[PDB]
Amino acid sequence: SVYLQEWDIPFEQVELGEPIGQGRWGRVHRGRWHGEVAIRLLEMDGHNQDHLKLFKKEVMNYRQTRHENVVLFMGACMNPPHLAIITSFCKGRTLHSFVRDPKTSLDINKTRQIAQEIIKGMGYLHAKGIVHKDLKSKNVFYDNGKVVITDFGLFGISGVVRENQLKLSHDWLCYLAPEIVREMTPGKDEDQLPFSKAADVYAFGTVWYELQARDWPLKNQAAEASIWQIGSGEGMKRVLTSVSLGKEVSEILSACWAFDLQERPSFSLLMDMLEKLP
Amino acid sequence: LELDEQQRKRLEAFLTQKQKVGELKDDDFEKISELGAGGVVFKVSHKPSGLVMARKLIHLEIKPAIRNQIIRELQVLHECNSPYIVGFYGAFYSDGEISICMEHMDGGSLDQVLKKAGRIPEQILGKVSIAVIKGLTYLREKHKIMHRDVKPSNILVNSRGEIKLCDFGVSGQLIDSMANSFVGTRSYMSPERLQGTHYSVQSDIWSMGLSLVEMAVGRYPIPPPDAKELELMPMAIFELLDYIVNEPPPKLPSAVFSLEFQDFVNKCLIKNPAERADLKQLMVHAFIKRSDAEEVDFAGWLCSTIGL
C-alpha cells in the first residue's frame, strides 16, 4: 500500500470530474489537483501475487522522471484492490485526430520538428531504462507547438480487465513490431510480449508514416490478415514501395521498420537522421 | 435459383409469418437459453407474437448518426430470402447494442453437431455443398455480395432438413466502423485474403473447402495430423497463418473417401484463386451431381445423432 502523501507534489485534495474514455486499462477521468489532472482508475484482482510488489516498483520508477516532452507523472495511490494513477492533464488535440483534420497544414518542417520532440521524449525514457510500451499517435498530444507523450509504461501492470479468443484492435496492430505479433497467442497476457527499446522505435516509424500519409499504413483488414502481413514483414515492404515520399523520409521509415530488431536505430541516432533533412 | 415449387411454399410460409409483427423493442423478448459466445446469440421468446426467434447480441458504444446509416444499409437484408439463407426479422438499436433477431435453427451449428457426432459422413457433406454453392450463387447474382466469413459455426441446421447460411457481409459501412475485430485459434481465411491483395468470392470457396475437410475428418486440419494420428482418427496464431500461406494446402486421406469427394475439396483448396474452381465449375462437378441425385433422409440422421 502506497498513498498520495509520499509524493514530490504537495497533496491536499483531488476531485474527480467527467470521464473522458474507457479502455482495457481502467477509466480515465478529467480531474482537478489548482490545475487539471488526468486520473486513471484501476482494479487489481492480483491479490498480492507480486502484482502490487511490481506495481510499487514501477510506480516508484516513474517518480524519478521529469521532461518537457513527457507527461508529468504526479501520484499513484493504491488502496487495494482499487488503484489510481494521476498524471498531468494535456490540453489540446491528440496527434491522431490532429494529423487527420483537413484544416491542418503540415509541411516538411512542421513534420521534422514534431518528430524531434517525440524522439527527445522517447530518448529520455530510454536513458532512464523506462521502456515505453504502447507508443502510438493516440497517446501523443499537440497544443500549438507543445508536444507531450502519454500513458508510458502502462502495459507493465497486471490488473484485471474477455475470453479465450484474442482481443485486438486495428489501430494498435499498425504499431506492433513483428517480434511481438509472432508471439501473440490466446490465453497469453500483454505482459508476456517482447516489448523492448526496439519495439518502441518501430512504433515511432508508424508514427512517422502517419505524419506523412495522414493515415495508417494498412487499410482496415481483418485482424488475421494484418497479423501475417506484419509478422512476415511483407506488409511493410509493400506499403513502402506502393507510395514514395522521399529518399530521406523513406530512409528513416525503412530504418525504423527493419525486420531484424537489432537493425533498428537508437533514438539518439534518430535525432541526427532528422537533422540531415529538407 | 432453380426454385422448386415446395421452396416457394416454405419461403411464402415464412413471408406470411413476416408481417405477424411490425415493431421491435427490448422488452418484447424473453431470454429462453444461451446458444453460444463469439457477439453472443440467445434463444428468445417474442411476446407480441408467438414466434420463437434467435436474438444475437453485439455490444457496441458508438454515436447515433453513424448508426442510422448502418441500419439503413442493414434493412436490405430483409430483401434477401432463400431456402439456403436464414430468415431475418428486423434490426433495431437498444441499450448500447444492436440486436439482430433471426430464424431459430434447432440443430445449431455444424461445429456443435460435429462435436456430438465425432465425424460427419461423406453423404451428408454432399448435400451441404450444394446448399452452400447455391447460396453463394444467389448472393452473387441477385445482390452482388460476397459472404466473407464462411465457416462451420455459421452453418445452421433444423429438423425439417433445411441448410442455411448466416453472418454474411451486407454492410460496407459496418465493416469499416468496427474498429475492434476478434481473432481466435482457428482461421478459415484464404491465403490471398491474408496477404491483402484483391479478392472476390474465390476466397469464400477456399473457406468452404477448408471447412469441409474439418467436418469430414473431425479435426481442424492445420497443422496436419501425423501418419499415426490419422489412423487413430500449442501454436501461436502467426504460425498457423504462415502455414496457410506457405505450406501445401490440407487434403483428404486417400483410403476412406471417394475420388469425387477428394477431387472436389482439392479444387476448392487450390491456393491460386484464379485456378481454384469457381461456382460455375463447382455446380457441374461429379461430386455435386452424385449428391444431388442421392436419396438421403437428412432429417432422420440429424435427429438420431443429436438425440432429437
Ligand SMILES: CC(=O)Nc1cccc(-n2c(=O)n(C3CC3)c(=O)c3c(Nc4ccc(I)cc4F)n(C)c(=O)c(C)c32)c1
Ligand atoms: C473487418 C471485417 O472483415 N468485418 C466483418 C467481415 C465479415 C462479416 C462481418 N459480419 C459478421 O462477422 N457478423 C457476425 C459476428 C456475427 C455479422 O453478423 C455481420 C452482419 N450481421 C448479419 C447479417 C445477416 C445475417 I442472415 C445475420 C447476421 F448476423 N452484417 C449485416 C454484416 O454486414 C457483416 C459485415 C457481419 C464483419
Ligand SMILES: Nc1ncnc2c1ncn2[C@@H]1O[C@H](COP(=O)(O)OP(=O)(O)NP(=O)(O)O)[C@@H](O)[C@H]1O
Ligand atoms: N494525460 C492525458 N491527458 C488527456 N487525455 C488523456 C490523458 N491520458 C489519457 N487520456 C485520454 O483518456 C482516454 C482513455 O485512454 P486509454 O485508456 O489509453 O485509451 P486509448 O489510449 O484510446 N487506447 P487503450 O489504452 O487500449 O484504452 C483517451 O481518450 C486518451 O486520449
Ligand SMILES: Nc1ncnc2c1ncn2[C@@H]1O[C@H](COP(=O)(O)OP(=O)(O)NP(=O)(O)O)[C@@H](O)[C@H]1O
Ligand atoms: N441463427 C442461429 N440460430 C441458432 N443457433 C445459432 C444461430 N447463430 C448462432 N448460433 C449458435 O451460437 C454459436 C455462436 O455463434 P457465433 O456468435 O456466430 O460465433 P462464431 O460464428 O463462431 N463467430 P462469428 O461468425 O463472427 O459470429 C454457434 O456456434 C451456434 O451454435
Ligand SMILES: [Mg+2]
Ligand atoms: Mg491512452
